[PDB]
Amino acid sequence: YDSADCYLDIQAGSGGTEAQDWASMLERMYLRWAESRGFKTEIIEESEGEVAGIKSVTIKI
RNA sequence: GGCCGCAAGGUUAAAACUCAAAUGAAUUGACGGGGGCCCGCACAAGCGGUGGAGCAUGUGGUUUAAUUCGAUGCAACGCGAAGAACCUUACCUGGUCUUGACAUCCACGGAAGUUUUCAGAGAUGAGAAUGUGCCUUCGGGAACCGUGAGACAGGUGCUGCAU
RNA sequence: AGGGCUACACACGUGCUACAAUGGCGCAUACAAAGAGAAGCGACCUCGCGAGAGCAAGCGGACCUCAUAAAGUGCGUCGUAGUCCGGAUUGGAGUCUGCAACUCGACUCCAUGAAGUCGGAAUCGCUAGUAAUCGUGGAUCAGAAUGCCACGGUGAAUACGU
RNA sequence: CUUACCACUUUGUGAUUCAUGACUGGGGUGAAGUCGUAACAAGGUAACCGUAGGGGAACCUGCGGUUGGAUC
RNA sequence: AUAGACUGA
RNA sequence: GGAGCGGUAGUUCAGAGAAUACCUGCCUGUCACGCAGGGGGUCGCGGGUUCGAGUCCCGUCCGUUCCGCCA
Ligand SMILES: [Mg+2]
Ligand SMILES: [Mg+2]
Ligand SMILES: [Mg+2]
Ligand SMILES: [Mg+2]
Ligand SMILES: [Mg+2]
Ligand SMILES: [Mg+2]
Ligand SMILES: [Mg+2]
Ligand SMILES: [Mg+2]
Ligand SMILES: [Mg+2]
Ligand SMILES: [Mg+2]
Ligand SMILES: [Mg+2]
Ligand SMILES: [Mg+2]
Ligand SMILES: [Mg+2]
Ligand SMILES: [Mg+2]
Ligand SMILES: [Mg+2]
Ligand SMILES: [Mg+2]
Ligand SMILES: [Mg+2]
Ligand SMILES: [Mg+2]
Ligand SMILES: [Mg+2]
Ligand SMILES: [Mg+2]
Ligand SMILES: [Mg+2]
Ligand SMILES: [Mg+2]
Numbered sequence: 001y002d003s004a005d006c007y008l009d010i011q012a013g014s015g016g017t018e019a020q021d022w023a024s025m026l027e028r029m030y031l032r033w034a035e036s037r038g039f040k041t042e043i044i045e046e047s048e049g050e051v052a053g054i055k056s057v058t059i060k061i
Numbered sequence: 062g063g064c065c066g067c068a069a070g071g072u073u074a075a076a077a078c079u080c081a082a083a084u085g086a087a088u089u090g091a092c093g094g095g096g097g098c099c100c101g102c103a104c105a106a107g108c109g110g111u112g113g114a115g116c117a118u119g120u121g122g123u124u125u126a127a128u129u130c131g132a133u134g135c136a137a138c139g140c141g142a143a144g145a146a147c148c149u150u151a152c153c154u155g156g157u158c159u160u161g162a163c164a165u166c167c168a169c170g171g172a173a174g175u176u177u178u179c180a181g182a183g184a185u186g187a188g189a190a191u192g193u194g195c196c197u198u199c200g201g202g203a204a205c206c207g208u209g210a211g212a213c214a215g216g217u218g219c220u221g222c223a224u
Numbered sequence: 225a226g227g228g229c230u231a232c233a234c235a236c237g238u239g240c241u242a243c244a245a246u247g248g249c250g251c252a253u254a255c256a257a258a259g260a261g262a263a264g265c266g267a268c269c270u271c272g273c274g275a276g277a278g279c280a281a282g283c284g285g286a287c288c289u290c291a292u293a294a295a296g297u298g299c300g301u302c303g304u305a306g307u308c309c310g311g312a313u314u315g316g317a318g319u320c321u322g323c324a325a326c327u328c329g330a331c332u333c334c335a336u337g338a339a340g341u342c343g344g345a346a347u348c349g350c351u352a353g354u355a356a357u358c359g360u361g362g363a364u365c366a367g368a369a370u371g372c373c374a375c376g377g378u379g380a381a382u383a384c385g386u
Numbered sequence: 387c388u389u390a391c392c393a394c395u396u397u398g399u400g401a402u403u404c405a406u407g408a409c410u411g412g413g414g415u416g417a418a419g420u421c422g423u424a425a426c427a428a429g430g431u432a433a434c435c436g437u438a439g440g441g442g443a444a445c446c447u448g449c450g451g452u453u454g455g456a457u458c
Numbered sequence: 459a460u461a462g463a464c465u466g467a
Numbered sequence: 468g469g470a471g472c473g474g475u476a477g478u479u480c481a482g483a484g485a486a487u488a489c490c491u492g493c494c495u496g497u498c499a500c501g502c503a504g505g506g507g508g509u510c511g512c513g514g515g516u517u518c519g520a521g522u523c524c525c526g527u528c529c530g531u532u533c534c535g536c537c538a
Binding site: 145 | 227229230231232234236238240241243312313322323325326327329338339342343344345348349350351356357363364367368369373380381382385
Binding site for chain 2: 429457458
């Protein structure tokens with residue numbers, strides 16, 4: 001699968017809302033890194049956090 | 062498990078495991094959709110605005126080689142900035158330098174300086190002339206430019222949760 | 225050295241100008257305060273429709289310059305229309321600083337003439353020379369204010385009360 | 387030789403105790419999850435006790451009792 | 459008359 | 468296998484609309500709730516009639532039903 005398209009799943013953990021914000025900060029830099037490499041970005045699913053951030057994101061790169 | 066009861070259940074009554082506390086009275090604050098008494102353009106009475114339009118300016122976001130850094134409820138957002146074409150500039154691209162742009166200090170060479178060409182976007186580099194002066198134990202040098210050290214310079218680099 | 229901080233599918237904050245008749249425009253005519261000026265303030269005269277240009281006094285200033293204040297008053301006109309409102313945007317031609325206004329300054333002249341007809345939820349300031357409104361000056365600064373700081377002109381309404 | 391006593395051993399049925407057993411009831415710990423906000427102020431329907439019923443859940447309601455309830 | 463909730467150094 | 472019903476906003480339902488949902492701006496110290504302004508599907512898929520089709524007709528996937536028996 002070295003040349004296969006990758007699918008990234010980011011789920012928040014310990015930290016609650018702050019963890020969700022950290023997850024949102026984590027996915028943003030992954031998307032920007034993929035854009036810099038030229039890879040296509042596709043938001044498969046994102047379950048927005050209750051207060052801030054997103055609990056879980058699945059993005060196809 | 063035993064006894065009692067139609068039943069609901071009552072009475073007697075543990076163990077494993079887990080924690081370093083649980084708890085009572087009182088004290089100082091803080092808070093209450095508790096009480097009482099007051100103050101402020103805080104409401105109430107008025108006047109004029111913003112939110113709709115265009116433009117100026119700042120910020121978040123996006124973009125970008127860079128879109129420099131900081132300020133984020135009131136108490137950030139015409140804020141640091143009482144003023145970015147160059148400079149400022151701390152950012153990016155490219156061309157360059159490496160005791161250095163900026164300081165002390167050692168030794169050596171030179172006055173310092175003032176003008177002309179020269180190739181480069183410029184930094185810089187190659188020259189060419191001009192003067193080569195002043196205090197002066199006339200013995201010195203003093204200043205100001207270069208060379209070679211190497212102790213050092215340098216940072217708008219991080220932490221305002223060390224100050 | 226050049227470029228960027230001025231980038232632009234958007235959102236927010238603070239302001240300026242308007243949506244006009246308590247007004248636009250043309251003519252005439254009164255009343256202020258405060259402040260700065262020597263690599264600076266710049267008179268008078270001449271030229272340019274204009275921004276400004278040439279020449280050249282005065283002043284280190286209660287002396288000279290910046291420097292006609294506007295709102296106001298009189299007359300005329302416009303006559304309720306996106307208009308003789310509004311001046312965004314754009315084309316052309318210029319002036320000034322500065323080595324150099326392409327990115328990216330200010331201003332002038334001709335031309336064009338956008339939205340905007342009083343703004344939803346919501347929200348702000350003000351108790352007297354205050355609010356509202358009108359001009360003037362200064363710091364920064366070679367050039368670059370609708371921002372900041374200060375100066376005066378007209379000048380209200382309302383407060384039963386907690 | 388025989389009788390009596392009697393150990394080993396055999397049968398049936400109970401008791402007690404240990405280990406284990408598909409499944410199942412509650413209990414204790416969570417540096418983060420979902421649903422509410424029941425208690426602490428008069429906690430926003432005063433709280434609690436016994437009892438009965440009801441409800442995802444903390445809990446709600448009826449009857450009696452207490453102050454270990456504020457304002458008045 | 460209505461009015462809920464603030465994880466973890 | 469036979470006889471009917473359907474298939475439409477992300478979902479559930481009407482015939483291109485409603486509720487929920489989703490943005491944006493408010494309120495709030497922040498979220499929720501609440502207020503205000505918006506957008507969102509071209510009718511499961513194909514053909515044919517029709518000047519004209521989500522609609523009418525046929526075929527096809529797709530789910531829903533009832534029946535499929537007597538020796
Ligand atoms: Mg028992
Ligand atoms: Mg009021
Ligand atoms: Mg506006
Ligand atoms: Mg910034
Ligand atoms: Mg810093
Ligand atoms: Mg620059
Ligand atoms: Mg430079
Ligand atoms: Mg501190
Ligand atoms: Mg800037
Ligand atoms: Mg500009
Ligand atoms: Mg003076
Ligand atoms: Mg006009
Ligand atoms: Mg219009
Ligand atoms: Mg007062
Ligand atoms: Mg000035
Ligand atoms: Mg200036
Ligand atoms: Mg005034
Ligand atoms: Mg409660
Ligand atoms: Mg209660
Ligand atoms: Mg009940
Ligand atoms: Mg009694
Ligand atoms: Mg909750």
